[PDB]
Amino acid sequence: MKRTYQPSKRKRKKVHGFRTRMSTKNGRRVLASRRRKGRKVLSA
Amino acid sequence: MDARDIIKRPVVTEESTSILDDKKYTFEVDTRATKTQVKYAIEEIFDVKVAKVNVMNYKGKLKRMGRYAGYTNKRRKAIVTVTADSKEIQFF
Amino acid sequence: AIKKYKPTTNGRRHMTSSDFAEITTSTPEKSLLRPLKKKAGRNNQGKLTVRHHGGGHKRQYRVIDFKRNKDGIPGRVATIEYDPNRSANIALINYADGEKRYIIAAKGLEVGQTIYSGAEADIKVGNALELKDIPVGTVIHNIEMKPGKGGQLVRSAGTSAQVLGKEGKYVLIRLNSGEVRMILATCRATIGQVGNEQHELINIGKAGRSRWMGKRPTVRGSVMNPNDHPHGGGEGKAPIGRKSPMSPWGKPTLGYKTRKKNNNSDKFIVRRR
RNA sequence: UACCCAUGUCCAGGAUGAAGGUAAGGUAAUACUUACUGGAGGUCCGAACCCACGCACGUUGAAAAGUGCGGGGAUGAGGUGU
RNA sequence: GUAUGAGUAGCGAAAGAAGGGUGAGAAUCCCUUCCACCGAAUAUCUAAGGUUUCCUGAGGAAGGCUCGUCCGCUCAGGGUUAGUCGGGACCUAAGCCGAGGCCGAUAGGCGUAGGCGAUGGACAACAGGUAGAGAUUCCUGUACCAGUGCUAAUUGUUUAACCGAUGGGGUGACACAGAAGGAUAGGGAAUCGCACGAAUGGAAAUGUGCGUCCAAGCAGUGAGUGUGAGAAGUAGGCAAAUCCGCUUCUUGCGAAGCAUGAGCUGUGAUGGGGAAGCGGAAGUUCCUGAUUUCACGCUGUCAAGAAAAGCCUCUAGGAAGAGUAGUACUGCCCGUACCGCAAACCGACACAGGUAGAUGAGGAGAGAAUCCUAAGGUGAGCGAGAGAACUCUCGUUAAGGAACUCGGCAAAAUGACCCCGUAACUUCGGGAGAAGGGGUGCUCUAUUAGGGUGCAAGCCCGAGAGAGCCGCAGUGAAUAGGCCCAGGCGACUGUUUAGCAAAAACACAGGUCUCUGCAAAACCGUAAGGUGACGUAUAGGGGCUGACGCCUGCCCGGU
Numbered sequence A: 001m002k003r004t005y006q007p008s009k010r011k012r013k014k015v016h017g018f019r020t021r022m023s024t025k026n027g028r029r030v031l032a033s034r035r036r037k038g039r040k041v042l043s044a
Numbered sequence B: 001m002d003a004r005d006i007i008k009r010p011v012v013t014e015e016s017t018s019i020l021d022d023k024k025y026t027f028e029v030d031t032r033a034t035k036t037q038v039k040y041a042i043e044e045i046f047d048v049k050v051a052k053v054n055v056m057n058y059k060g061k062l063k064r065m066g067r068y069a070g071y072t073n074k075r076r077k078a079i080v081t082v083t084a085d086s087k088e089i090q091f092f
Numbered sequence C: 001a002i003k004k005y006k007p008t009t010n011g012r013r014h015m016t017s018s019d020f021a022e023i024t025t026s027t028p029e030k031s032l033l034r035p036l037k038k039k040a041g042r043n044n045q046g047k048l049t050v051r052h053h054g055g056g057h058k059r060q061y062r063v064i065d066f067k068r069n070k071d072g073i074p075g076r077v078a079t080i081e082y083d084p085n086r087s088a089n090i091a092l093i094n095y096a097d098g099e100k101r102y103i104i105a106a107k108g109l110e111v112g113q114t115i116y117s118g119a120e121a122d123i124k125v126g127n128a129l130e131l132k133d134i135p136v137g138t139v140i141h142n143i144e145m146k147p148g149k150g151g152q153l154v155r156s157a158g159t160s161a162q163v164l165g166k167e168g169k170y171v172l173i174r175l176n177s178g179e180v181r182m183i184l185a186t187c188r189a190t191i192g193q194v195g196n197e198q199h200e201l202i203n204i205g206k207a208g209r210s211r212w213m214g215k216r217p218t219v220r221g222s223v224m225n226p227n228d229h230p231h232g233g234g235e236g237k238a239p240i241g242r243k244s245p246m247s248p249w250g251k252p253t254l255g256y257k258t259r260k261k262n263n264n265s266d267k268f269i270v271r272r273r
Numbered sequence D: 001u002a003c004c005c006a007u008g009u010c011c012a013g014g015a016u017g018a019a020g021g022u023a024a025g026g027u028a029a030u031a032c033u034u035a036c037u038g039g040a041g042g043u044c045c046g047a048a049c050c051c052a053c054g055c056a057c058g059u060u061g062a063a064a065a066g067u068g069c070g071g072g073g074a075u076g077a078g079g080u081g082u
Numbered sequence E: 001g002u003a004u005g006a007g008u009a010g011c012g013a014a015a016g017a018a019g020g021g022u023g024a025g026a027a028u029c030c031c032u033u034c035c036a037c038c039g040a041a042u043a044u045c046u047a048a049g050g051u052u053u054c055c056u057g058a059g060g061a062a063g064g065c066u067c068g069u070c071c072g073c074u075c076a077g078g079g080u081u082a083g084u085c086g087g088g089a090c091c092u093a094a095g096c097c098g099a100g101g102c103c104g105a106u107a108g109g110c111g112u113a114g115g116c117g118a119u120g121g122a123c124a125a126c127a128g129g130u131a132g133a134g135a136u137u138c139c140u141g142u143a144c145c146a147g148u149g150c151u152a153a154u155u156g157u158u159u160a161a162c163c164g165a166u167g168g169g170g171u172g173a174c175a176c177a178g179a180a181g182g183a184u185a186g187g188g189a190a191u192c193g194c195a196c197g198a199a200u201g202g203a204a205a206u207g208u209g210c211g212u213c214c215a216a217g218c219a220g221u222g223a224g225u226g227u228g229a230g231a232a233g234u235a236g237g238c239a240a241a242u243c244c245g246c247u248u249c250u251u252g253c254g255a256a257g258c259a260u261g262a263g264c265u266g267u268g269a270u271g272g273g274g275a276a277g278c279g280g281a282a283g284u285u286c287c288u289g290a291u292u293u294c295a296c297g298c299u300g301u302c303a304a305g306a307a308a309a310g311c312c313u314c315u316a317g318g319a320a321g322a323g324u325a326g327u328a329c330u331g332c333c334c335g336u337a338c339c340g341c342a343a344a345c346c347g348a349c350a351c352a353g354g355u356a357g358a359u360g361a362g363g364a365g366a367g368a369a370u371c372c373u374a375a376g377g378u379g380a381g382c383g384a385g386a387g388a389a390c391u392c393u394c395g396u397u398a399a400g401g402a403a404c405u406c407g408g409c410a411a412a413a414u415g416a417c418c419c420c421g422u423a424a425c426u427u428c429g430g431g432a433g434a435a436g437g438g439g440u441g442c443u444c445u446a447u448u449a450g451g452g453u454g455c456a457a458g459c460c461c462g463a464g465a466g467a468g469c470c471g472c473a474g475u476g477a478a479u480a481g482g483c484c485c486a487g488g489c490g491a492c493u494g495u496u497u498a499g500c501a502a503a504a505a506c507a508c509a510g511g512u513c514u515c516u517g518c519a520a521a522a523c524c525g526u527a528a529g530g531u532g533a534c535g536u537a538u539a540g541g542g543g544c545u546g547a548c549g550c551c552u553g554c555c556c557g558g559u
């Protein structure tokens, strides 16, 4: 039938975007730990 | 920017040169230049009278050269048409 | 009266409804309307705190005058019309100033009457006075508890109270539930009974007519699981295998009194219901 | 996916004929009877749409739940987009 | 890393054939003819999503379930043009953030002013052309919206032209169902124009084929739909108001006047498009007719059907400049390529699955059903040849007709329109399409009896009867209820274990018990803050029973 992933440009940025991570204390911890690994892309 | 900073270089192709006789000139402009700045930049450099400007944005093409993937520069292309009672620009 | 439907369909077999013979107009006053949005029993935090709510016809709020502060200015009953937000009907009043306000329609109120409020008002159905100057034995409604707040105690359709006596600073009132209560003598009240007394006799008749009013289905606790309700579990049908029937949160539900035992307002209640 | 909120949108055709109204009759006046009108309903038959009752086949599948022939609802406690 | 199974299973719904061409090499690439498939789609647009997959020139290592000279693959160059389209510089809903502020071991939670936020509101452009790739964007023609400067006249200067709110008021502004109309799109016949005029018995005309037009804007008109007029006075609209609201008098009515209003006519048109043989003739009359528009307009019902901006108006205020006409100039940012029921989106795949919306023709037909076709699009990325067992999907069967089997499971049978006729029981509505029967084709009466349309010409709709004619068979194909008797359960419509159980289970309208006097009880949270409820005992929460009919007995020692 229909599958679990239904793409949407707006829905992706509003949940996983950079400004969403920067608005919470625990979202800034995700960016801090992703910078520690030196990951190419932070957030979505 | 300056007049020489807004405008970078002309575009010389089959489509670009097929409209030179129509008094339409194709340029590559700065990515952050508005349609009005391009109008006054042309009149400062070539001293022609400008009638219209049409702009469009181009993305970068994904290119490969062996195990390496990247993109070319994104472009901003402007087409300038001049009034009939004005001089011409010699791409030559 | 009460309209009755022929048994044309199984869902129309037992329905009864009002005929709205007392409703004068079908358009509300545009300047006294406010939007309402359904909460569906959802909390400040988006949680479902009250069950069996949500999903009916959409409505709009009518600004209704409960304080009735406009003293000395006559007001004519212009229309009697329908309010979806309450059981009783409402009436539009054109005051002599040119300004319009909504009140609850009392029993025996019809278009063309004149309604007063204040100390000099007469004891007629629809007028509003302070309790200090209303004769003993009259039937009133829209009683308020704090002076200047607005009508609060008797407000449903067909309900009414009665004045029993005076105790100086206070006035005895027998509320609609049969409770005798002391009310401050400076508070206000409106004369008469609320006028839609046929509202009790409506037979809904359909499962889906309850859904138009915003009432989602209710599930008995005996057909749940042991982790859902104290009554859940058991092979086959099971009785209430406990000392007393209990609410979904513990706290026995049959006969158990839940009024606070050290409540301040307990000295103003002469006798309980 | 479950429930809810705000704002949009979809449901080919056909059938039946509730309340009410009008005319003739009928009465002291009403009940009531007959014709025409009217267009109600979690009404009926049935496509799109939603669903999943039977069987067969697939079962290192076309498919980590499907297809084929029949089947239920189809103006509502309806389906569906953002 | 490499074997065995093994050159074995598979190669993913479907109709292809031949003749030319290219090439080292052709079932598979290109062209031509014939044939076949879809056609309320397998056709045309357009959102989301994907990001160059679009075009041209080269290429055949790998990918393509075979082949390849080919490709959505590789390489190199190109391609997306907006004052008017969609979004921002305009507005707000749900929701989110939130100066001060209220709570809280920290972290933080909540929340006022204020602000973001479309899936909605407001808002000025149409018709053609474009042979590699863009078109309300480029070009041609004709427009509109806002603003600016300049020329010529007009007017006014503080008893003050004119402007006018970030404030008041009106509008914007709204549900569902039903019916009857006006118009138009679409469709169909004659007329007219052009071409042919014929292969095999016949036809030079009651012959055949194709076509039988056109915007926005501007001027006029217009089916209709709403439709009380004037005067006087102001306890109200945070101040004021000549505006709104309220009161009182004169005057009354399918008659006008005011708002809207689909459409029609002239101009736009000395323009554009147009079948044939590069130029281009003709464009009339009638019938039918919407699921589109007038228009939530009218009627009815109860479950009682967003906000703000915008527009108009009123003053508060600002005021020496202001309108008018003509001309010329000015108008920003983002998207625009291509696929888009699909080989380019979500499913690991070039995957028999899923994917919102607008249009969606003809014959027969009530119909978007069914069969065959139009415009348009396709022949499905392995083949040919033999016609064994066995498996799957179909078609017929002599005599019998459930004897099969756990069980008539599966299959077979009924099926459309018109007429006759129809039981027990009943909550009087039903049961009921009960059951059971009869008639359907073609020709002549006959451009019917009669209707719709029109001034007439004419054009559509078509029941009864008679006479006949032909088959085994006349809704001659596809599509279209099998029925009856009796009992258990559940009153009914509805819901349920995505992926083993659709039910006698849940729900339901109704009944009863019990709590709750409002800072209500109950519930979430440490609290603040909330739902309950912008409600008030005819209201709200909890337990049990489950339409309707007749009823619901005894025990208070134990808990």
Ligand SMILES: [Mg+2]
Binding pocket: A015
């Ligand atoms: Mg979310």
Ligand SMILES: [Mg+2]
Binding pocket: A041, A042, A043, A044
């Ligand atoms: Mg990421």
Ligand SMILES: [Mg+2]
Binding pocket: B055, B056
């Ligand atoms: Mg652009």
Ligand SMILES: [Mg+2]
Binding pocket: C051, C052, C218
């Ligand atoms: Mg409840």
Ligand SMILES: [Mg+2]
Binding pocket: C218, C219, C220
């Ligand atoms: Mg229940």
Ligand SMILES: [Mg+2]
Binding pocket: C223, C224, C225
């Ligand atoms: Mg259970």
Ligand SMILES: [Mg+2]
Binding pocket: C226, C227, C229, C230
């Ligand atoms: Mg327990």
Ligand SMILES: [Mg+2]
Binding pocket: C230, C231, C232, C233, C234, C238, C239, C240, C241
């Ligand atoms: Mg138990």
Ligand SMILES: [Mg+2]
Binding pocket: C235, C236, C237
């Ligand atoms: Mg048991």
Ligand SMILES: [Mg+2]
Binding pocket: C247, C248, C249, C250, C251
């Ligand atoms: Mg409880």
Ligand SMILES: [Mg+2]
Binding pocket: D042
């Ligand atoms: Mg209904």
Ligand SMILES: [Mg+2]
Binding pocket: D043
């Ligand atoms: Mg139904």
Ligand SMILES: [Mg+2]
Binding pocket: none
């Ligand atoms: Mg769907």
Ligand SMILES: [Mg+2]
Binding pocket: none
């Ligand atoms: Mg289900």
Ligand SMILES: [Mg+2]
Binding pocket: none
């Ligand atoms: Mg079906």
Ligand SMILES: [Mg+2]
Binding pocket: none
């Ligand atoms: Mg099926």
